[PDB]
């Protein structure tokens, strides 16, 4: 009798590289370099697309950011034409403030409990339209209650009851004209001082015309602080002051009671697709150890290499005939 | 391969063997047949899966790093940031290239090795009852029906049973 020993072969072999040979055919191989993205920055993740919403706007509530005031997110996507503000102004320490928010997890809001006696608090503007002229959702605009009436020296203290450090934002208003300040807040010296156990500073309006944006020569500037638990922020002002109505609490400081921990905030021009590794080209699978898509990455990512392909043999040498 | 079985004294692979990587083909009084060897097949597959387990699904988390694209000329510090990243990529590109070349050489050698082990094991089983024809085939010097062939494949072949018949056939004129 005859007994022959042998091995299999396939008609469709794959060429791989070895130590001694540039081109050798094996029965099967797998690709080690990820070379494509689906074109979207992300399935299985909780994501929010701010869209028109600027990110900082989530804190103080322009009409844009109406949906996203109390958002809960694992992944947060900023967008390019987004405007943080309805009435022209800018945040102090702006870039630093966003980085806080991106990694927040989202934000929870609770009222600071402020109440007012003799003032207009319902200040509205052409800039925040919203069915009818309006203001920031999360703040109150304070006015004399009778035009040209000198504004009251007032004091507010709010104390951070919660375990998570609170986020507090306030405004200084620089009026369109020296007149408008007068009409709004009365006349004479205007001083605003903000006091916390780690924080104190004093602000004064410097009223003037500035280039007309959103139809307003006037500006509002936002200053923010982080308040440790059990700490009082004291607000003292004779006017020109935009007041926080609500405190912002991060979700990744929650006690596992709202708690949605640790988000990654990205900047993307791509659509979304719910069908771990992010590149500027879009998210990429991370099953492969290497990738050729982008040297810039975030997350659990394959390592960037220059090769476009690297085949790992997963079968024996292919010897047909 | 370094053992010289696959692409060596075994002239070619069998496309018609689709139930295993290694196996037996026989010809006897009852006909011609083919049967896969599961143990050697699984031994090769386990080693390859061991390699895959080291490479697949084990990436490492990175978060905040350095910038790697720049919109303005800055000189010194930007030269340094670019050089650091370029250095890192070349070193990882080297690691990846060598890893694949080394693993592949080894995969081709281990699969050749499993084939050789099966051949050597079979040879020892047959004792003085068969001769190696030099192409991975044994000439068996006795009547060996399907059950006999089967006993060889499953390691229950008793050479003493056939030895007298085999020796007379081998050593004559």
């Amino acid at each position, epitope marked *: 009798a005859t007994l022959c020993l042998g091995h299999h072969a396939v008609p469709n072999g794959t060429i791989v590289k070895t130590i001694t040979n540039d081109r050798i055919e094996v029965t*099967n191989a797998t690709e080690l370099v990820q070379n494509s993205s689906i074109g979207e920055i992300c399935k299985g993740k909780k994501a929010v697309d701010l869209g028109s919403c600027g990110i900082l706007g989530t804190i103080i509530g322009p009409p844009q950011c109406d949906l996203h005031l109390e958002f809960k997110a694992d992944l947060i996507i900023e967008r390019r034409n987004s405007s943080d503000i309805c009435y022209p102004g800018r945040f102090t320490n702006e870039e630093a403030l966003r980085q806080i928010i991106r990694e927040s997890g989202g934000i929870d809001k609770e009222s600071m409990g402020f109440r007012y006696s003799g003032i207009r608090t319902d200040g509205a503007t052409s800039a925040c339209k919203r069915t009818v002229s309006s203001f920031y959702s999360e703040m109150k605009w304070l006015s004399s209650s009778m035009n040209n009436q000198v504004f009251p020296q007032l004091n507010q203290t709010y104390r951070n009851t919660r375990k998570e450090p609170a986020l507090i934002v306030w405004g200084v208003h620089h009026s369109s004209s020296l007149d408008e300040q007068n009409k709004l807040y009365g006349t004479g010296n205007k001083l605003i001082t903000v006091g916390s156990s780690k924080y104190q500073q004093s602000f004064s309006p410097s009223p003037g015309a500035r280039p007309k944006v959103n139809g307003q020569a006037g500006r509002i500037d936002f200053h923010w602080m982080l308040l440790d638990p059990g700490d009082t922020v004291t607000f003292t002002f004779n006017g020109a002051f935009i007041a926080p109505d609500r405190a912002t609490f991060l979700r990744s400081n929650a006690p596992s009671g709202e708690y949605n921990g640790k988000s990654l905030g990205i900047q993307s021009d791509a659509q979304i697709d719910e069908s771990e590794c992010f590149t500027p080209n879009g998210s990429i699978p991370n099953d492969k150890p290497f990738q050729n898509v982008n040297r810039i990455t975030y997350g659990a990512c394959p390592r960037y290499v220059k090769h476009s392909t690297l085949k790992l043999a997963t079968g024996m040498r292919n010897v047909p005939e | 391969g370094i053992f010289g079985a696959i692409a060596g004294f075994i002239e070619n692979g069998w496309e018609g063997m689709v139930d295993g990587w290694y196996g037996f083909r026989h010809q006897n009084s009852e006909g011609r047949g083919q049967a896969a060897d599961l143990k050697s097949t699984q031994a090769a597959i386990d080693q390859i*899966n061991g390699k895959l387990n080291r490479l697949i699904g084990k990436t490492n988390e990175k978060f905040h790093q350095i910038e790697k694209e720049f919109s303005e000329v800055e000189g010194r510090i930007q030269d340094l940031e670019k050089y650091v990243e370029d250095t890192k990529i070349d070193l990882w590109s080297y690691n990846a290239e060598l890893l694949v070349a080394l693993e592949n050489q080894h995969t081709i050698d281990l699969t050749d090795s499993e084939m050789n082990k099966l051949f050597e094991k079979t040879k020892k089983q047959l004792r003085e009852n068969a001769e190696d024809m030099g192409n991975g085939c044994f000439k068996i010097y006795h009547k060996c029906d399907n059950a006999c062939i089967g006993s060889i494949r499953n390691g229950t072949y008793d050479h003493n049973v056939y030895r007298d018949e085999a020796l007379n056939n081998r050593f004559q004129i």
Partner: antibody
Amino acid sequence: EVQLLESGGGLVQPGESLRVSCAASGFTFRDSALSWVRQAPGKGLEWVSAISGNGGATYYADTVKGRFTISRDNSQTTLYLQMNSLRADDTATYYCAKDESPPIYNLMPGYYSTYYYMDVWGKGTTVTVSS
Amino acid sequence: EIVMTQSPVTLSVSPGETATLSCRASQSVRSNLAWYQQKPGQAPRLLIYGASTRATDIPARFSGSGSGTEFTLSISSLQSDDFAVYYCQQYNHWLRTFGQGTKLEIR
């Protein structure tokens, strides 16, 4: 539908033998692996053994390394488990569980991929070992 | 031959809150790790395999993570029917082992 049904079990004296069947019905072509997992009421899960292709497993836990033996009958599509030399602590609800592996592993369809996770569990058969 | 320890033995979480579980494992393990949801009087059901890859047609509120030794399982939006016990297995030592089990409460 990939459900399997466990038959057999019951009350046995310590030291006796008992085999439990597992009718593998449905999507399973039975070129994939299968496993047994036992759990006693009042205790957690514990993997017992596994089977692959033909005789590729040979995979038993250290508790039953010398007692339990796993059979496979692909012609009638039923998985077995001969539990010999049963002791008192062998009283458990033996579950027959499907086995799935990532598609990168399991090169040859029949043989064992040494990384399996159980996806479809069975109804379970309770086996009590006392005097 | 490779013990698995879950923490804690039982946890109380209000419905809606996120419940994070622990699956500490002696010796390294990354490739294979499966989570299960065994409701009382029922067989275990696969939730996540590998480490983070969840099973087919299971809710997205079940999240998985971990590497080598420390592994976590977080249930985003909790429901009253999630009162099951959760387990975690590992590779390989040619001998898979299960976890002790984590009881989840919902007043």
